[PDB]
């Protein structure tokens, strides 16, 4: 395949207002270890390298938060994967049944994302 150093890569990043980890594209290395992230929700914010996870397609059995487009929030566990229209999806099992959600909707609660930071963290 092909890649570029940070800028352009889809990654998961912490929303710096002490929030969870959400999907985004690194728009630019800001400097000093900050990289700006065009979140897939269209927000654009600097995030420090330690707060970005760049090789993070969610592993199955990981616990995650899930957001419906009609803005309902829950948490559950990844139990599968899909690809549709060039976008990456996860079947989040909740209440013993699978529900499909998309990368930007499968948000890693901060204590979940921490377990990935030690491996996938840029910093």
């Amino acid at each position: 395949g092909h890649m570029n150093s940070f800028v352009g890569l889809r990654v998961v990043a912490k929303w710096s207002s002490n929030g969870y980890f959400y999907s985004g594209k690194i728009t630019r290395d800001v400097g000093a270890g900050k990289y700006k992230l065009l979140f897939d929700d269209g927000y654009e914010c600097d995030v420090l390298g330690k707060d970005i996870l760049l090789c993070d397609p969610i592993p199955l059995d990981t616990e995650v938060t899930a957001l419906s487009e009609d803005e309902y929030f829950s948490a559950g566990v990844v139990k599968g994967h899909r690809k549709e229209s060039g976008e990456l999806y996860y079947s989040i099992e909740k209440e013993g049944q699978r529900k499909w959600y998309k990368r930007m909707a499968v948000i890693l609660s901060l204590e979940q994302g921490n377990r990935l930071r030690e491996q996938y963290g840029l910093g």
Partner: peptide
Amino acid sequence: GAKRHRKVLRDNIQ
């Protein structure tokens, strides 16, 4: 019951 609890999503961004 429950509803979006943190900042996520937006509209007209395309």
